[PDB]
Amino acid sequence: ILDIITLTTDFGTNEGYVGAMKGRILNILKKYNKDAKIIDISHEIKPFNIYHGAYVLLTAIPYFPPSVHVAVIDPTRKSIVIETKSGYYLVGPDNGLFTYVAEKLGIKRIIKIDEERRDVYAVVGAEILINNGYDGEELDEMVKIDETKKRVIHIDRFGNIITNIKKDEVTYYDTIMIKIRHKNGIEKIIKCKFVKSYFEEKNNFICLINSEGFLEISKFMDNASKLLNVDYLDEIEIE
Amino acid sequence: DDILDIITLTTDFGTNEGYVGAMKGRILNILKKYNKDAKIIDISHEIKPFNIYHGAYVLLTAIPYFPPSVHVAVIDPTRKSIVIETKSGYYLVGPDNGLFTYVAEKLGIKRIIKIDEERGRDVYAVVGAEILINNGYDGEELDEMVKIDETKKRVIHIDRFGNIITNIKTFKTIMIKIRHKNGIEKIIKCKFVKSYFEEKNNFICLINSEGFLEISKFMDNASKLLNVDYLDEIEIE
Amino acid sequence: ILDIITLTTDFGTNEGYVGAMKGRILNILKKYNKDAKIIDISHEIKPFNIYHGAYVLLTAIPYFPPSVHVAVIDPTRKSIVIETKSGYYLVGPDNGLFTYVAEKLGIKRIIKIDEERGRDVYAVVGAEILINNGYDGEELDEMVKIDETKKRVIHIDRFGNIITNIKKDFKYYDTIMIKIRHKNGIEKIIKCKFVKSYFEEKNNFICLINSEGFLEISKFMDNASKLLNVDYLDEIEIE
């Protein structure tokens, strides 16, 4: 029984788009007398950044019980409804947004949303709540964020540089040499000390495994991102 | 359903303080004291401080999509308070200063009630919850209300991207003249288009999702580039 | 019966931590079919600033009806559950965070939390209290409290107003002399007009009693904290 619907957008709160979305959903639900809880994950995803969105979805969703998750972030086409092994429904565009969250929870079926209607996502999400599921044209694959090439995965509110590299891929207190190439060609090489906490090796750059299992580059009381001029997608090379 | 179950909140309180929480708290406190079950939705709390033009535009964009319900909006540079019942039963609670202008017009005003002393941020809250409990409101009626003049063409609101939205609801290189507050006038050339992608080299104007003529600049902030703010006069020619 | 649970953090929403916390609680809640409202008080508390948090909690909570409140801000770990006279429960670090709210509501009992499980602990412990409508464990005698006898800066407004420790206990319109000692050591002396509204005396620095009953320093349409360069915990002396 589907009970929760979550929203994750890059709309911001300066506008009233998010509110509209809640209104639509809320309207449909009341018309079919379907009680459900609307939960906000985040509306501060950086405009058009599917990677940022992908990372926040990966961090929040797995902690919810089976439920519906609407995520609207697309720098513009294709849009899907994903069904997870355990029965989670992921509403949103087909551009990679759900890549990580999809793998984590397991893909059971990919159903293409058909134009029988932006505000599509909201409606589709509500529909899934009332009908407690969704049916439609099953699809072969889905657009997926290439996870083979190591790069800057996400950037913190503090400016910490979160990488692709998972704990299971990295051989403590040793000195690592991280190479970072920006999209424009400039290349930066730094020396980090793989530690356990943020309060360690305060004098230099440090890298540790964060609460999501990825190698992250940080600088005590600073903003490594701004210090290295590192942006999303920069190529990472450890050695 | 003819039962009031939803109540939204729109403010310029921000989240740095606990005023928003205190408001949700008082609402909940009252709803419990009458075992009234209702959902509380936030539309936005990032309305620019004291800017009723920003609020009015946000309310217009979100409220129409909700089913009949109560909506508390608190943005006001210090007075006269009101409850507005729309045609389809919606209830708008807030200051009588033009805040509810656009939304009230699109939902049709059934009646405007005056809020007495009978009872402040924690005042629009009690009223909104009271409406939920009694499934309605009553008071001395008001003939007309304060309204944001929509006949004088000016900057309606400013996007998070810096886009300049005018209250111009046209025909078509457009030439737009702006009269800032101080009196200085600027004149720019816009390429009237359909999407934000077209004509990247120069300024562009277009009709946005809300239906108003909007000025923008590819991946940049027109508002800052032109130094345009709320209420600047617009003149197309 | 406990039906409401509020969240107050310094997590922000650039990340999915707040979402994971909502899901976590919801998950436990849907596993005992316990229905409850998850209210958001604020997630924009300044990172590690417990003074900021303590102030927000004092402002919002007393207006709620008896319920549960999870507040997560701590630069560090001792964890507690404060039970109020009227049945409110405060859940979070024993570092002074709940100092003001605790006194206002009145303490019935402070219970230590046995690490038999930190983002998740407070979450789990909160839902748990909702499911059982109460808590139990080793009782603690006293908690850490923010020293309120030491006159200083309580909080800083979003406008930049300097909120002080001094409660509603000189006269109106008089000219108060205020000395402020920063952390660095330097002292600043300013003259203030004790008024009753932010609009009066738009020329000089003014001070007044804010909606929380505290003496506040403000400057019409300007940021008092930035102008005087005042930070949290700066010592305040009136003469």
Residue B54 CB partners (closer than 8 Å, separation 6+)? B12, B47, B48, B75, B157, B158, B230
Q: Do residues C114 and C206 both lie within one domain?
A: no
Range of the domain at C155: 147-239
Contacts of C19 in chain A (CB under 8 A): 6, 8, 39-42, 56, 59-61, 63-64
Tokens of A126: 């509500």
Bridge partners of residue C205, in order along the sequence: C192
Contact between C42 and B122 using a beta-carbon 8 Å cutoff: no
What is the rounded CA–CA span in Å between residue B43 and residue B64? 12
Q: Are A41 and A57 in contact (CB under 8 A)?
A: yes
Please identify which residue in the block is written with the tokens 């699809």. Answer: A139
- In this structure, what are the phi and psi dihedrals at residue A26, rounded to the nearest 5 degrees? -60, -35
Instruction: Classify residue B33 as exposed, middle or buried by CB count within 10 Å of its CB (0-12, 13-18, 19+).
Output: exposed
Q: Which of B66, B165, B221, B230 to probe the A interface (max A CBs under 10 A)?
A: B66
Instruction: Look at strands C175-181 and C235-238 and give their pairing.
Output: antiparallel
Q: Where are the alpha helices (DSSP H) in A1-66?
A: 17-31, 50-60
What is the rounded CA–CA span in Å between residue C42 and residue B19? 10
Q: Which of B5, B6, B11, B24 to probe the C interface (max C CBs under 10 A)?
A: B24
Bridge partners of residue C156, in order along the sequence: C162
Give me the residues of A, 155-194, that contact C with CB < 8 A: 156-158
Q: Are C105 and C111 in contact (CB under 8 A)?
A: no
The residue among C126, C146, C166 that closes a domain is: C146
The residue among C146, C178, C196 that closes a domain is: C146
The H or E element spanning position B102 is helix B101-107
Total number of domains in chain C: 2
CB atoms within 10 A of CB C222: 14
Please identify which residue in the block is written with the tokens 């509403």. Answer: A91
Tokens of B4: 């009031």
CA distance B88 to chain C (A): 28
Q: Do residues C84 and C162 both lie within one domain?
A: no
Distance set, CA A23 to CA A119, B42, B59 (Å): 11, 11, 12
Of A59, A63, A67, the CB nearest to C15: A59
Please identify which residue in the block is written with the tokens 């656009």. Answer: B102
Bridge partners of residue C193, in order along the sequence: C175, C206
What is the rounded CA–CA span in Å between residue A238 and residue B92? 58
Residue B117 CB partners (closer than 8 Å, separation 6+)? none
CB atoms within 10 A of CB C103: 12
Q: Do residues B140 and B161 both lie within one domain?
A: no
Q: Do residues A76 and A190 both lie within one domain?
A: no
Contacts of B59 in chain A (CB under 8 A): 16
CATH of residue C129 = 3.40.50.10790
Alpha-carbon torsion angle A88, A94, A95, A97, nearest 10: -20
Q: Are C78 and C92 in contact (CB under 8 A)?
A: no
The residue among B148, B169, B199 that closes a domain is: B148
Instruction: Classify residue C9 as exposed, middle or buried by CB count within 10 Å of its CB (0-12, 13-18, 19+).
Output: buried
Tokens of A121: 């996502």
Q: Is A211 annotated as a binding residue?
A: yes
CA distance A12 to chain C (A): 11
Minimal-distance CA residue of chain A relative to B39: A37
Minimal-distance CA residue of chain B relative to A13: B44
Please identify which residue in the block is written with the tokens 């708008």. Answer: B92
Residue list for the binding site of B for adenosine: 12, 76, 163
- In this structure, what are the phi and psi dihedrals at residue B35, rounded to the nearest 5 degrees? 35, 55
CA distance A116 to chain C (A): 31
What is the rounded CA–CA span in Å between residue B31 and residue B26? 9
CB atoms within 10 A of CB B70: 27
Contacts of B65 in chain A (CB under 8 A): 19-21, 23-24, 27
Residue A184 CB partners (closer than 8 Å, separation 6+)? none
Q: Do residues A132 and A150 both lie within one domain?
A: no
Task: Tell whether C106 lies on the interface with A, counting CB pairs under 8 A.
Answer: no
Distance set, CA A80 to CA A96, A139, B125 (Å): 11, 9, 40
The single-letter DSSP state of residue B63 is G
Residue list for the binding site of C for adenosine: 10, 74, 161
Q: Do residues C102 and C134 both lie within one domain?
A: yes
Minimal-distance CA residue of chain C relative to B24: C64
What is the rounded CA–CA span in Å between residue C63 and residue C85? 15
What is the rounded CA–CA span in Å between residue C231 and residue B179? 40
CA distance A115 to chain C (A): 30
CATH of residue B183 = 2.40.30.90
Minimal-distance CA residue of chain B relative to A123: B65
What is the rounded CA–CA span in Å between residue A62 and residue A7? 14
How many Cα atoms are found within 13 Å in the side-chain-facing hemisphere of C150? 10
Q: Do residues B220 and B160 both lie within one domain?
A: yes
CB atoms within 10 A of CB A170: 14
The SS3 of residue B225 is: helix
- In this structure, what are the phi and psi dihedrals at residue B63, rounded to the nearest 5 degrees? -55, -45
What is the rounded CA–CA span in Å between residue B100 and residue B84? 9
The H or E element spanning position A109 is strand A107-112
The H or E element spanning position B213 is strand B213-216
What is the rounded CA–CA span in Å between residue A156 and residue A162? 7
A136: amino acid identity, one letter: G
> Which residues in chain A have their C atom more than 2.5 Å from the N of the next written residue, marking a break after them?
76, 117, 171
Q: Are B174 and B205 in contact (CB under 8 A)?
A: yes
Q: Do residues A135 and A165 both lie within one domain?
A: no
CA distance A24 to chain B (A): 5
User: Which candidate, C157, C165, C154, places its Cα nearest to that of C238?
Assistant: C165
Q: Do residues B125 and B159 both lie within one domain?
A: no
Q: Are A161 and A230 in contact (CB under 8 A)?
A: yes
Q: What share of chain A is helix, strand, coil (3-state, %, to 5)?
A: 25, 30, 45
The single-letter DSSP state of residue A61 is G
The gap from C-alpha B157 to its chain's centroid, in whole angstroms, comes to 10
- In this structure, what are the phi and psi dihedrals at residue A123, rounded to the nearest 5 degrees? -60, -55
Contacts of A225 in chain C (CB under 8 A): none
Task: Tell whether C62 lies on the interface with A, counting CB pairs under 8 A.
Answer: no
Approach to solving: X-ray
What is the rounded CA–CA span in Å between residue C25 and residue C28? 5
Q: Is A74 annotated as a binding residue?
A: yes
Tokens of B224: 């800052």
> Which residues in chain B have their C atom more than 2.5 Å from the N of the next written residue, marking a break after them?
78, 119, 169, 172
Tokens of A67: 């439920």
Order of strands, sheet of A152-155, starting from the edge strand that comes earlier in the sequence: A152-155, A161-166, A214-218, A206-209, A187-194, A175-181, A235-237
Q: Do residues A35 and A78 both lie within one domain?
A: yes
User: Which candidate, C107, C54, C55, places its Cα nearest to that of C212?
Assistant: C55
Q: Are C235 and C151 in contact (CB under 8 A)?
A: yes
Instruction: Look at strands B109-114 and B155-158 and give their pairing.
Output: unpaired
Please identify which residue in the block is written with the tokens 């450890």. Answer: A238
Q: Do residues C61 and C158 both lie within one domain?
A: no
Of A4, A40, A156, the CB nearest to C26: A4
Contact between A65 and C21 using a beta-carbon 8 Å cutoff: no
What is the per-residue DSSP string for C16-82? SHHHHHHHHHHHHHTTTT---EEEEEES-S-TT-HHHHHHHHHHHGGGS-S-EEEEE------EEEE
Q: Are A87 and A134 in contact (CB under 8 A)?
A: no
CA distance B117 to chain A (A): 31
CB atoms within 10 A of CB A63: 20
- In this structure, what are the phi and psi dihedrals at residue A13, rounded to the nearest 5 degrees? -120, 5
Q: Do residues B64 and B178 both lie within one domain?
A: no
